[PDB]
């Protein structure tokens, strides 16, 4: 089917963002990356004050750790193959679908080699459909 | 009426015909959200207007006296000459009250006003080229009516607003390496003093009103100037403006718009109590209350100082007080708002000269900055009254505390996330319909059982139905049927009951034809443009 | 290009206005009537509706003349009679106003909305840079101008003429140093109630003088209202504002706000004088701006478990502790003592102090601990202070030690 | 107060219940023996609630009295929100 | 000297050049009687000057007051507080006797 052709402005690819002529699109990786470091500095420094209790501090570190994680992946990307096997009698990768539902209308393809019991038997008199099916 | 000798006279002497033709014909565009100025406008005279009623009754003196007014649940308190006339514009005056609430409310009003407008000013792009100079002096605006609402409220001398007072003091004192000198001048001494209700009074009435308006003013001029801006849409360029005239139209709606906004004023003003000072009492160093706070465009700053941990630097015999960073942070977040056109300039590389706006949608980053913005100060405005939440609401106060701490870095990344990710689905949707039609939402079923939802093009169509794919064009898209009028009524009545058909004919016709006219005009203006570009 | 009078009188009226705003580059592309049926029914239908809102604006106004004029708009107490009548007062005013404007501005919005013609117009804007002649000409005048003075071959001329100019500019804003003010000068005369004025002292600095401070609780009196052939008269000759205050008076887990209360300015106990005006010296003293001290009382088992200062040892007597009322981080009333959890809170900023580990902020953006007054009891068993405060009290500054 | 403690709304109190709160010092509520707050005193603090609790505001509706806060809550929302009604009324969409 | 920036911004974003051009070319006659409107002008500017520096040390208040302050040919004496603060902006204020001098002799 037909479409526009894809374009890149600042680095950002219309497919990913559409209207990237059309404003600021972006926000780099690194600087994403330095957001959250700076502000991680700032999350851990809470920790420091005169306060006695500890559900801040386990507020705090869980947050950290969630944030610095987030953070590891974003920088370490993990990603993953796409699996290759074939179970429960799927199908290898190159098959072509016929439509079942057009073959039952037309009795064609796999609906095509029924016998003359079979024929009767989806109350079709095989004498209305010998002219027509193929030689 | 015989206007022609009066028209001679002026034109014969001031050469003017020429001159006030231009301004009867200048041009607006009429969006809905170009009119969140004109409420800052029209607050602002209203707080002129009011503010000059209540200095015919106010004496802003601290000196002392025994009370002896019309409140009698406070005769015989010693109160100082400020309090006392605050109480009797309240209720010995007639229909005093009445115009201290509606100058009250009209400073909320004032603020919220000009916080909605600056946030269409920077969602919408207005700011940039060759517009950054509004947007510097907008902020300065916005800072000094802040600022104005502060002293205003500190002048009747209440123990909520001299509450507020002392943490001014405190925090002035705090300053190094000068804080100490700072205070004695802005004080004149140790805080009370004399001279700091009158000197609080002079700024409030003359000093800082002279600036707002001399801004104001150079603000409305280059606005007049720089013909404003307009959102893309069939016609509009970068160079023209598409609206209505100054004359019948548009002066109309603004005094109409003004009216509204008087009116909704008074109403606010009789109906609703607002900061109701005879409850509150004299002010008292040795005496707080519970629900402290700020006024509400002063909350975000309350926020800041809850927030922060108790941080001292001693280096030893000197000290830095905590609260000192909460000053730095109120400069960043100051200079981060002033200077935002050059960053956005250094970071994109733009600077073009825009007459077109940008919808928030198409430029995403800006809008999740925004955003987050918009929640950092919320967190901050809830920060300030975290205690009346905490009490209203059975949370721990504390937990409000570190609710504050943490929200402040978790949110405003929530909130960009969020709104980056909305953002460019909205611009997704927007190219569904731009390249296979208005989802109509009828469904038809074919011959061969296939359910298929019947599409509305904008557009040519190749030979197999399908739309030519149209461009983006930063302008609105229709998404449903209604937008494009088939859901208009083609009845045409009363409520009880119909016209003559001769005139429903008639009218139905003439609407007709007006519709397709103003397509064509504005397709023709359209291919006109495109000529212009060649 | 021009018109002689004889063409601008062959035109029509319509022909005239399209020439005047070309004249602007504006040309209005679409514009129509918004009733251009002859008798149309929904033409009378919609001057109803602007006639509604006018009707009410008339109503409102007239209305709120009434109200303003003739409702009884003076004060009236809880239990008066027309109290309703007086709280109304304000209410009415606004709701007739209200309806009065809003009705008005309604009307002109319906009027904008169905009667006057609807129009796009199309104004060319001219902005950007200037058209290059008036660039180059300007520029070339400012030029002739700045050579034409011969001003920039005079180095001394220019450089004398910005010195004075500077120099002048300080003369103009000199005077601005009458508002300088040395905070270390003490204040004028003696030592007072309030203290030298300065940060580092308080009406508590009296002790140093040798005079006796009692610690005195706020009766909270106001004047009397003497009434006689002469008029009327608030008066306050016979009034403590501030009276002694014993050892007994406080229950266990109880607190007081008290004041320095000079030996000179007592009029209590069985030495009153009816006579003895000391109103207006004690009202000075409540008023100071750190002057407020917060005396609790501890329970036993409280004070089995309380933690000293360094040198802040025997500042308490038995269980009665001395603290000053005044917030460490930016100068609230610290008024709010949690009797049981023994935590002294302030409802500015949350911070929370430790009665029991010598006020040491344990919550908030307070970092420093309370100050702590000596108290004692006298030979007659009234609480005075022992001695003066070892800290600056209230916030911190930049000359300030720890 | 701290850790999810409050100053309740005094409105449900009756007079005795104000006395014995007073003098007997509820939870982390600070006591106030006769000694200190005399009977004269506790007469007038209850007349002061009281009064209060019972007159009405003059100047309308009190956005229970919570100060700048509430009042703030009722501009900066339905204030703002209103107006901008009226400003799409008057004005156009896209 | 880096005018050539500056001047290129200021028009680029005013389209100013032909209108100052028309400001800076404006002829005056030179006559010395059309010197004195100036004078007034001039008076004006000044007045308002140190107009808002009194504010700063001045109270408007009628209240009584006994006077301790810097001239003490007056202590003792009961005045209200205008009078007061007049007095304090004449001898406690340094420069302020100066200030108010000038402001009444620019009125006159
Ligand atoms: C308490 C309340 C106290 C009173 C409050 C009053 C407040 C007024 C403040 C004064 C204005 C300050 C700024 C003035 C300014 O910029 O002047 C320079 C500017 C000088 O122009 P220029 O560049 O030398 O002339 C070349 C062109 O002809 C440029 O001209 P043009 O071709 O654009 O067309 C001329 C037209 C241009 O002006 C307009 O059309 C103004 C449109 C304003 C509406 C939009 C907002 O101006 C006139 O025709 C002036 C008519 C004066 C009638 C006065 C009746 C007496 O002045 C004007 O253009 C007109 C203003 C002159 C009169 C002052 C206004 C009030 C007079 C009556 C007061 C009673
Ligand atoms: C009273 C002002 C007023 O209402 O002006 C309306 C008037 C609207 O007249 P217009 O029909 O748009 O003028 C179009 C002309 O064809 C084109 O303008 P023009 O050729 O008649 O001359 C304009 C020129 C003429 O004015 C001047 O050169 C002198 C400045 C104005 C008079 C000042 C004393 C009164 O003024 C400007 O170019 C304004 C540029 C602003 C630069 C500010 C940079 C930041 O706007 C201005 O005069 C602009 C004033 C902007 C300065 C405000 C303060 C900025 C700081
Ligand atoms: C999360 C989801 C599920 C939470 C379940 C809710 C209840 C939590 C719970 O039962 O925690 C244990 C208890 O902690 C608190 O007391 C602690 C001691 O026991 C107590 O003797 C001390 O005296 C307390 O010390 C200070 O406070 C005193 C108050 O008297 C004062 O004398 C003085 O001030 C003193 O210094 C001390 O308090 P912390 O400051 O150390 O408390 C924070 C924290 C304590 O444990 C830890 O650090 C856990 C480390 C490892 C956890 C990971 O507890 C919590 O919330 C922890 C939540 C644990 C349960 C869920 C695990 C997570 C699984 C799902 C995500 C108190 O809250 C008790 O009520 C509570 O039962
Ligand atoms: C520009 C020219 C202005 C210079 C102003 C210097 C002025 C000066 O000498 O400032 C003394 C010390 O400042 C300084 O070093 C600060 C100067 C730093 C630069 C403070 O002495 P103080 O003891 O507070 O005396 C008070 C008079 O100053 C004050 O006028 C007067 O009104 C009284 O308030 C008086 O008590
Ligand atoms: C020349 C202009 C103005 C004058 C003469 C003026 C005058 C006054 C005066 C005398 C008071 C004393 C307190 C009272 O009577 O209730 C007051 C209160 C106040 N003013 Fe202004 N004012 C002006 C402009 C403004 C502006 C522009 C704002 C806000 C941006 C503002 C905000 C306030 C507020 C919030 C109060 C407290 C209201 C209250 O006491 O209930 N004022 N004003
Ligand atoms: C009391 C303060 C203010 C008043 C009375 C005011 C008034 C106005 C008015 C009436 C307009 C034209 C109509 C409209 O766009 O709504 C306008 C436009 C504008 N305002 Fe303000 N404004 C104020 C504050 C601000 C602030 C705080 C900012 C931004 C920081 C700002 C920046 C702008 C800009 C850049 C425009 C031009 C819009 C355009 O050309 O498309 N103004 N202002
Ligand atoms: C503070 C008040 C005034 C100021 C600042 C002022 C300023 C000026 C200035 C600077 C001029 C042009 C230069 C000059 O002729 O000196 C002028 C001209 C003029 N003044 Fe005034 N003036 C003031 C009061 C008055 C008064 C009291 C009158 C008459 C009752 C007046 C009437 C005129 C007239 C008619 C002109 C035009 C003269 C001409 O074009 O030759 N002005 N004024
Ligand atoms: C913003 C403008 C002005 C301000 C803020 C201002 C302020 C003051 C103040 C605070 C005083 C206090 C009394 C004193 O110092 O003894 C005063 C006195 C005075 N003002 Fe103004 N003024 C202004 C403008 C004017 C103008 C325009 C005039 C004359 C047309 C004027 C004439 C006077 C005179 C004659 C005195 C008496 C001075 C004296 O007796 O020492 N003022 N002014
Ligand atoms: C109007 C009124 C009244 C007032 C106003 C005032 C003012 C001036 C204000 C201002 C404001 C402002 C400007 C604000 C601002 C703000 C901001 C900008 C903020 C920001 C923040 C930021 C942050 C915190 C960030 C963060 C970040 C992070 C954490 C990140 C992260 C990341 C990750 C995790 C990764 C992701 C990915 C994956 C996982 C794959
Ligand atoms: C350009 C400005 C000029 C010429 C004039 C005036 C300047 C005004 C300043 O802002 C601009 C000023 C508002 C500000 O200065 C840091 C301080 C008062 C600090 C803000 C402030 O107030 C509070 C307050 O008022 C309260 O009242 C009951 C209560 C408060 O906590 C409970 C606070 C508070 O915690 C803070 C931080
Ligand atoms: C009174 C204050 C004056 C404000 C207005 C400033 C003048 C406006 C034009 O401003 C100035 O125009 C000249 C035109 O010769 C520009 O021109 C610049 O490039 C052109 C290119 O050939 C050169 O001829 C010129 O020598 C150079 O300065 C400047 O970059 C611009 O800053």
Redesign the interface.
């Known amino acids: 089917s037909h479409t526009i052709e894809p374009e890149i402005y600042r680095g950002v690819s219309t497919l990913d963002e559409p209207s990237a002529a059309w404003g600021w699109h972006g926000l780099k990786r690194n600087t994403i990356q330095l957001a959250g470091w700076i502000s991680v500095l700032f999350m851990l420094g809470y920790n420091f004050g005169n306060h006695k209790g500890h559900v801040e501090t386990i507020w705090l570190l869980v947050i950290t750790a969630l944030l610095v994680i987030g953070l590891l992946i974003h920088l370490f990307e993990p990603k993953l193959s796409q699996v290759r096997t074939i179970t429960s009698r799927n199908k290898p990768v190159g098959h072509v679908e016929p439509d079942w539902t057009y073959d039952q209308a037309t009795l064609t393809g796999t609906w095509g080699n029924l016998t003359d019991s079979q024929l009767r038997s989806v109350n079709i008199e095989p004498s209305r459909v010998a002219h027509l099916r193929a030689a | 009426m015989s206007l022609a000798t009066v028209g001679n006279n002026l034109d014969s002497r001031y050469t003017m015909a020429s001159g006030i ?2 301004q009867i ?3 607006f565009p ?7 100025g ?2 800052a406008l029209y607050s602002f005279i209203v707080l002129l207007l009011t503010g000059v009623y209540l200095t015919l009754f106010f ?3 601290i ?4 009370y ?1 007014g ?4 406070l ?4 109160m100082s ?1 400020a309090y006392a006339t605050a109480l009797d514009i309240s ?2 005056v ?2 005093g ?2 115009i201290r ?1 509606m100058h ?2 009209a400073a ?2 004032f603020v ?2 000009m916080l ?1 407008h600056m946030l269409r000013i920077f969602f919408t ?1 207005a700011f940039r ?2 517009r ?2 509004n947007w510097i002096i907008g902020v300065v605006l916005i800072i000094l009516g802040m600022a104005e609402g502060f002293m205003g409220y500190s002048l009747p001398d209440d123990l ?1 607003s001299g ?1 507020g007072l ?2 001014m ?3 002035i ?9 700072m ?3 802005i004080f ?5 003093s ?2 700091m209700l ?2 609080f009074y ?1 700024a409030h009435v ?2 800082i009103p002279a600036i707002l308006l001399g801004l104001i003013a150079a603000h409305l001029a280059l606005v007049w ?3 404003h801006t307009q ?1 893309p ?1 069939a ?1 509009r360029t ?8 100054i004359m ?2 548009f002066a ?2 603004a ?10 004023l ?11 000072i005879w ?1 509150l009492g004299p002010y ?14 002063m ?1 975000w700053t ?1 926020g800041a ?2 927030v ?5 630097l ?1 280096l ?8 000192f960073w909460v000053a730095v942070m109120l400069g960043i977040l100051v200079v981060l708002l002033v200077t935002y056109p050059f960053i ?1 300039r250094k ?4 600077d073009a ?1 825009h ?1 077109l706006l ?1 919808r928030p ?6 809008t999740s900055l925004g955003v987050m913005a918009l929640v950092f100060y919320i967190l901050l405005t809830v920060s ?5 939440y ?2 209203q609401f ?1 949370v ?3 937990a409000m ?2 609710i504050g ?2 929200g402040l ?2 949110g405003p ?1 929530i909130a960009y996330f969020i709104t980056y990710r909305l953002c ?1 689905g909205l ?2 949707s927007d ?1 569904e319909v731009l ?1 296979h039609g208005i989802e109509t939402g009828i469904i038809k079923q074919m011959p ?2 296939a359910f298929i939802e019947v599409h509305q093009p904008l557009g040519p169509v ?1 030979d197999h139905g ?1 739309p030519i ?1 149209l ?2 064009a ?3 898209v229709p998404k449903q049927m209604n937008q494009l009028g088939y859901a208009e009524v083609e009845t ?3 409520f009880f009951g119909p ?1 003559p058909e001769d ?1 429903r004919a ?2 139905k016709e ?1 609407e007709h034809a ?1 519709h397709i ?2 397509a064509n ?2 397709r023709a ?1 359209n291919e006109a443009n495109i000529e212009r570009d060649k | 290009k021009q018109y002689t009078t004889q063409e601008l009188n062959a035109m029509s009226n319509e022909d005239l206005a399209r020439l005047g705003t070309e004249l602007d580059d504006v040309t209005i592309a679409y514009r129509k009537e918004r009733f251009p049926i002859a008798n149309d029914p929904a033409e009378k239908r919609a001057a109803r509706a602007v006639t509604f809102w006018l009707v009410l604006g008339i109503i409102g106004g007239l209305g709120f003349l009434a109200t303003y004029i003739f409702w009884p708009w003076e004060y009236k107490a809880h239990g008066d009679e027309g109290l309703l009548a007086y709280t109304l007062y304000t209410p009415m005013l606004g709701i007739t106003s209200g309806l009065c404007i809003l009705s008005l501005g309604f009307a002109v919005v319906l009027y904008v909305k169905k009667f006057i013609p609807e129009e796009i117009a199309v104004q060319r804007r001219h902005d950007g840079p200037s058209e290059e002649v008036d660039r180059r000409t300007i520029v070339a005048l400012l030029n002739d101008s700045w050579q034409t003075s011969t001003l920039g071959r005079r180095k001394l001329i220019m450089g004398l003429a910005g010195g004075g100019a500077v120099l002048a500019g300080l003369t103009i804003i000199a005077p601005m140093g009458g508002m300088i003010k040395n905070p270390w000068n003490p204040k004028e005369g003696p030592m007072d109630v309030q203290g030298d004025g300065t940060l580092w002292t308080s009406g508590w600095t009296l002790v140093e003088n040798d005079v006796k401070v009692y610690l005195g609780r706020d009766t909270a009196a106001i004047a009397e209202s003497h009434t006689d052939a002469t008029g009327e008269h608030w008066s306050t000759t016979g009034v403590s504002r501030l009276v002694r205050m014993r050892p007994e008076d406080l229950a266990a887990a109880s607190m007081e706000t008290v004041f320095p209360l000079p030996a000179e300015m007592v009029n209590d106990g069985a030495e009153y004088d009816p006579a003895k005006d000391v109103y207006e010296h004690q009202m000075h003293s409540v008023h100071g701006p750190r002057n407020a001290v917060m005396l609790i009382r501890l329970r036993t088992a409280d004070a089995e478990k309380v933690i000293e200062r360094e040198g802040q040892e025997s500042f308490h007597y038995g269980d009665y502790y001395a603290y000053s009322k005044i917030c460490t981080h930016i100068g609230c009333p610290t008024s709010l003592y949690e009797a049981q959890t023994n935590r002294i809170l302030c409802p500015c900023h949350q911070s929370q102090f430790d009665a029991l580990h010598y006020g040491k902020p344990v919550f908030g953006p307070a970092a420093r601990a309370l100050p702590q007054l000596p108290i004692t009891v006298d030979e007659e068993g009234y609480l005075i202070a022992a001695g003066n405060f070892i800290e600056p009290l209230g916030p911190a500054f930049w000359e300030r030690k720890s | 107060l701290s850790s999810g403690k409050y100053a309740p709304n005094l409105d449900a109190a009756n007079e005795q219940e104000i006395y014995q709160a007073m003098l007997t010092g509820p939870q982390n509520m600070p006591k106030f023996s006769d000694r200190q707050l005399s009977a004269d005193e506790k007469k007038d603090i209850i007349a002061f609630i009281k009064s209060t609790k019972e007159t009405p505001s003059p100047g309308g509706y009190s956005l229970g009295s919570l100060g700048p806060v509430a009042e703030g809550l009722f501009m900066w929302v339905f204030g703002i929100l209103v107006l901008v009604a009226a400003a799409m009324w008057i004005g156009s969409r896209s």
Do not use: C
């Open positions: 033709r231009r014909n200048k041009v009429t969006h809905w959200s170009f009119m969140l004109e409420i004496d802003p003196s000196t002392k006296v025994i002896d019309g409140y009698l649940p005769n015989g308190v010693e000459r209720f010995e007639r229909g009250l009445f609430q009250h409310w909320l009003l919220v006003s909605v792009g080229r060759p950054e100079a909520l509450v002392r943490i003091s405190a925090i004192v705090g300053l190094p390496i000068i804080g100490t000198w205070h004695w001048l004149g001494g140790d805080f009370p004399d001279l009158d000197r002079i003359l000093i100037y720089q013909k959102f849409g016609g970068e160079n023209n403006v598409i609206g209505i005239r019948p139209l109309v709606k005094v109409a718009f003004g009216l509204i906004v008087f009116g909704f008074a109403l606010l003003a009789g109906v609703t109590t607002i900061n109701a409850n008292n160093p040795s005496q707080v209350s519970a629900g402290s706070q700020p006024d509400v465009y909350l309350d100082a809850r922060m941990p108790a941080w001292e001693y030893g015999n000197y000290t830095i007080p905590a609260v956005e970071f994109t590389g733009d000269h007459n940008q949608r198409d430029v995403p980053v800006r300030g009254g975290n205690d009346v905490a009490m059975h721990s106060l504390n505390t570190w701490r943490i870095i978790v990344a460019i611009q997704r190219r390249e061969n059982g190749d399908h794919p461009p983006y930063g302008a609105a045409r009545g009363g016209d005139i008639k009218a003439i007006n006219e103003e005009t504005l203006l």
